[PDB]
């Protein structure tokens with residue numbers, strides 16, 4: 052049995068390194084949103100709330116994790132508070148991640164009413180409510196669902212603890228049925244699965260909208276060829292009626308002027324077709340190609356460019372949520388083995404430490420995802436770093 056302070060010194064040193072990195076990176080995130088008005092939107096208010104939770108991981112949760120690794124003597128409910136506080140921060144992160152996914156779904160599904168529905172004031176209130184619910188969920192053991200009623204008196208006596216004190220260890224005060232059923236299954240796993248469902252709807256909605264853009268583009272060009280090789284006025288009328296309805300479907304200053312020309316030129320050719328003037332209607336329909344090359348194709352391309360940027364932003368947000376799950380699942384899976392397999396030896400202490408360090412490292416990774424995937428964050432990070440450090 053090697054001296055406990057040796058392995059403890061490695062764990063503590065790594066934790067402090069993570070704490071420094073989590074504070075520095077996420078303070079940079081908050082400073083970038085504060086300075087850059089192009090970053091001041093509802094989506095990034097939840098990003099800041101998430102960064103604040105990660106700052107508090109370095110300032111409070113990691114010092115608390117270091118403290119509870121010592122098993123020091125403490126009043127049981129005080130031990131319970133410093134053990135449960137990380138649950139508050141994790142829950143707050145889940146609420147922010149779920150809000151970000153929903154915010155991106157609203158923007159892709161109903162962009163015409165996104166600015167009216169999703170405002171900064173309503174976002175600040177949602178953030179406040181989610182922080183309150185995070186304290187209620189994470190400190191639920193403080194309300195009585197704890198093991199303070201059944202202290203490990205032998206462990207407490209062997210460490211010289213006083214009356215009412217226990218050796219402060221996470222699994223001695225926080226009930227494992229809380230950790231598995233309430234915290235993991237209900238409060239972590241279910242919201243993560245909801246997020247997965249939201250992102251599946253975002254990508255399915257983007258793929259369908261991009262398909263609809265190309266369908267209207269193909270229908271516009273196909274019916275143009277139909278008019279050219281038509282032999283009577285009725286065939287020209289049939290193709291023009293399909294173009295007029297599709298031109299209005301794709302319409303939903305230079306943008307409006309382009310479609311005003313397009314619909315008017317269709318009406319011009321339609322009137323000639325209804326008068327039995329096939330050659331004159333076909334020549335009038337040929338003028339649609341000039342409007343298509345100068346206006347309609349530009350709108351198609353900019354509409355496509357906007358959807359591809361929303362896909363890119365949703366993937367970046369999904370990477371953040373997926374990395375949260377990857378970093379926290381080992382801890383929860385270990386708790387499942389402890390809880391569901393009492394015939395299995397408990398996961399060894401070094402693996403517990405590794406799983407804790409991994410969870411804490413998630414508070415370091417988000418600034419790097421923003422810097423590598425979001426140009427506005429990357430450029431703002433450079434301005435802050437070049438001008439102030």
Ligand SMILES: CC(C)CCC[C@@H](C)[C@H]1CC[C@H]2[C@@H]3CC=C4C[C@@H](O)CC[C@]4(C)[C@H]3CC[C@]12C
Pocket residue numbers: 124125126128129130132133
């Ligand atoms: C404004 C912010 C920064 C203040 C942070 C306050 C923190 C550090 C305080 C608040 C409550 C405190 C705990 C309250 C009760 C106990 C029981 C005692 O037997 C050991 C210490 C312990 C476990 C305390 C540790 C420090 C503690 C967690």
Ligand SMILES: CC(C)CCC[C@@H](C)[C@H]1CC[C@H]2[C@@H]3CC=C4C[C@@H](O)CC[C@]4(C)[C@H]3CC[C@]12C
Pocket residue numbers: 126127128129130132186190
């Ligand atoms: C944010 C919410 C939780 C309130 C903020 C105040 C917190 C940080 C402080 C204020 C008073 C503190 C409590 C005061 C008294 C006790 C009883 C003792 O046997 C163990 C510590 C314990 C349980 C403290 C835990 C932390 C505590 C609840």
Ligand SMILES: CC(C)CCC[C@@H](C)[C@H]1CC[C@H]2[C@@H]3CC=C4C[C@@H](O)CC[C@]4(C)[C@H]3CC[C@]12C
Pocket residue numbers: 376377380381382384385388395396397398399
């Ligand atoms: C992709 C990520 C999320 C997967 C994480 C898988 C990890 C957490 C799993 C894979 C194998 C698992 C181990 C397999 C066997 C045992 C032996 C048992 O006596 C204690 C638990 C323990 C030690 C498990 C702990 C958790 C474990 C290490």
Ligand SMILES: CC(C)CCC[C@@H](C)[C@H]1CC[C@H]2[C@@H]3CC=C4C[C@@H](O)CC[C@]4(C)[C@H]3CC[C@]12C
Pocket residue numbers: 380383384387388389391392
């Ligand atoms: C990752 C998402 C999608 C699902 C999460 C999977 C979790 C809940 C699964 C994956 C592997 C599972 C464990 C695999 C093996 C055992 C050993 C058995 O003696 C008791 C149950 C137990 C401990 C399982 C509990 C639940 C478990 C941890």
Ligand SMILES: CCCCCCCC/C=C\CCCCCCCC(=O)OC[C@H](O)CO
Pocket residue numbers: 055056059063067120121122123218
């Ligand atoms: C910025 C700060 C700079 C540096 C701050 C460093 C703080 C380290 C403080 C105490 C660690 C004491 C370590 C003692 C750990 C005892 C060994 C142990 O792990 O025993 C646990 C056992 O599980 C129990 O029952």
Ligand SMILES: CCCCCCCC/C=C\CCCCCCCC(=O)OC[C@H](O)CO
Pocket residue numbers: 110111114115118123124125
């Ligand atoms: C500006 C940011 C805000 C400041 C953030 C606060 C930082 C808190 C640091 C460490 C918490 C450690 C608390 C636990 C220490 C307990 C050690 C102890 O109490 O030991 C005596 C006890 O009786 C055992 O026998």
Ligand SMILES: CCCCCCCC/C=C\CCCCCCCC(=O)OC[C@H](O)CO
Pocket residue numbers: 173180187188
């Ligand atoms: C485990 C513990 C769980 C605790 C369970 C109980 C929690 C209460 C739940 C939600 C409160 C919702 C907040 C309502 C605050 C007022 C919102 C409001 O006024 O909205 C009007 C706004 O103008 C519209 O646009």
Ligand SMILES: Nc1nnc(-c2ccc(O)c(Cl)c2)c(-c2ccccc2)n1
Pocket residue numbers: 112113116134137138141221222382383386403407410411
């Ligand atoms: N058995 C066990 N032991 N320790 C922790 C623990 C304590 C402090 C922390 O800072 C961290 Cl990250 C983890 C968890 C645990 C597992 C999942 C979610 C929250 C806590 N589970």
Ligand SMILES: CCCCCCCC/C=C\CCCCCCCC(=O)O
Pocket residue numbers: 060063064067068071
């Ligand atoms: C580019 C600037 C980076 C900032 C530098 C700060 C890095 C320091 C990080 C970790 C060092 C940890 C100190 C550990 C002290 C001893 C703890 C112990 O053994 O118990």
Ligand SMILES: CCCCCCCC/C=C\CCCCCCCC(=O)O
Pocket residue numbers: 109110113114115117118121123
């Ligand atoms: C920027 C402010 C950050 C706060 C500074 C906290 C840094 C100190 C690091 C870890 C706290 C150590 C807790 C001591 C455990 C007591 C051991 C014992 O009593 O047996």
Ligand SMILES: CCCCCCCC/C=C\CCCCCCCC(=O)O
Pocket residue numbers: 172173174175176177179180183184187
């Ligand atoms: C003990 C906590 C359990 C009950 C949780 C109650 C939910 C949170 C309560 C109040 C949050 C206060 C902020 C409300 C302002 C809303 C602003 C808005 O949405 O536009």
Ligand SMILES: CCCCCCCC/C=C\CCCCCCCC(=O)O
Pocket residue numbers: 396397398399402
């Ligand atoms: C992504 C692959 C991971 C690469 C580095 C991480 C190392 C993996 C660590 C632990 C995996 C399982 C270790 C087995 C625990 C011992 C079983 C026991 O004795 O109870």
Ligand code: NA
Pocket residue numbers: 101104105140141144413414
């Ligand atoms: Na987090």
